[PDB]
Amino acid sequence: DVRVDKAVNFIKPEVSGVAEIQTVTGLSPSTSYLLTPAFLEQNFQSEAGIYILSATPVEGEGTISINMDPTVTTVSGFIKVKTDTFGTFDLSVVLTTASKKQTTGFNIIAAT
Amino acid sequence: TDVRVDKAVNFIKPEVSGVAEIQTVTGLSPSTSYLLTPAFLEQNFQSEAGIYILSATPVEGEGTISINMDPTVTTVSGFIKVKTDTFGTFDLSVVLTTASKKQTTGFNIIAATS
């Protein structure tokens, strides 16, 4: 089968254009996961500016892009990452404008 | 043990507002379960008035994909679990609230692999 093992929100980095590390824990050791973006009922115009998030694995493939530009809107990409022996993996997450404090996230999918 | 995107598929563009149509997805492995997740790339949902709102549900399966581009309440969420028939197909029910929103959205078909 394929299932969503965990649904997590993206972090909200403090400084525009400066990525921060997001660590996901508690997963199965040395296991391949696929991450896909998702978000629910968000107001991306609740304050000035454009919500633009990029996420990449420190060790893996792919990029998630969430760009809510009203002219050119993208919610796409997927990440392949394998946990270490502890059941953890790290992403690098950046917001182009850090005052966009909407909540977005991803699904963590495994075959089991 | 591993997982991959088997294929990326665009959602249909229903012709009539509010009237669900079937989208038949083909070419997969017989009698096999997949997960579907939403995605879209570089769309201008404001090329004309009105809101792009799509909902998709398998005819036989679990979950609903929702893509609601309302600027006050924007959703790109849900995931569908669906099993193919013995010929490698499955059907979705897809409904667009305003059919004149001809933007392109879609889903990833996620599969187990080695």
- Cβ(B59)–Cβ(A60) under 8 Å? no
3-state secondary structure A4-57: EEEEEECCCCCCCCCCEEEEECCCCCCCEEEEEEEEEEECCCCCCCCCEEEEEE
What does this entry list as its resolution, in Å? 1.2
B40: contact with A, CB 8 A cutoff: yes
B112: contact with A, CB 8 A cutoff: yes
3-state secondary structure B62-108: ECCEEEECCCCCEEEECCEEEECCCCCCEEEEEEECCCCCCCCCEEE
Distances (CA, A) of B101 to A21, B20, B47: 38, 15, 9
Cβ neighbours, 10 Å, residue A111: 21
Instruction: Judge: A44–B71 Cβ closer than 8 Å, yes or no.
Output: yes
Show Cβ contacts of residue A22 under 8 Å, excluding neighbours closer than 6 positions.
A10, A11, A55, A90, A91, A92, A93
B46: contact with A, CB 8 A cutoff: yes
Instruction: Judge: A111–B112 Cβ closer than 8 Å, yes or no.
Output: yes
Mutate to test the interface with B, among A9, A65, A78 (most CBs of B within 10 A): A78
Q: B41 burial class (0-12, 13-18, 19+ CB within 10 angstroms)?
A: middle
Contacts of B108 in chain A (CB under 8 A): 36, 78
- Cβ(A35)–Cβ(A64) under 8 Å? yes
Instruction: Judge: A36–B110 Cβ closer than 8 Å, yes or no.
Output: yes
Within the 61-100 window of chain A, which residues sit less than 8 Å (CB to CB) from chain B?
A: 68, 70-78, 80
As for chain A, the residues directly before each break of C–N over 2.5 Å are none
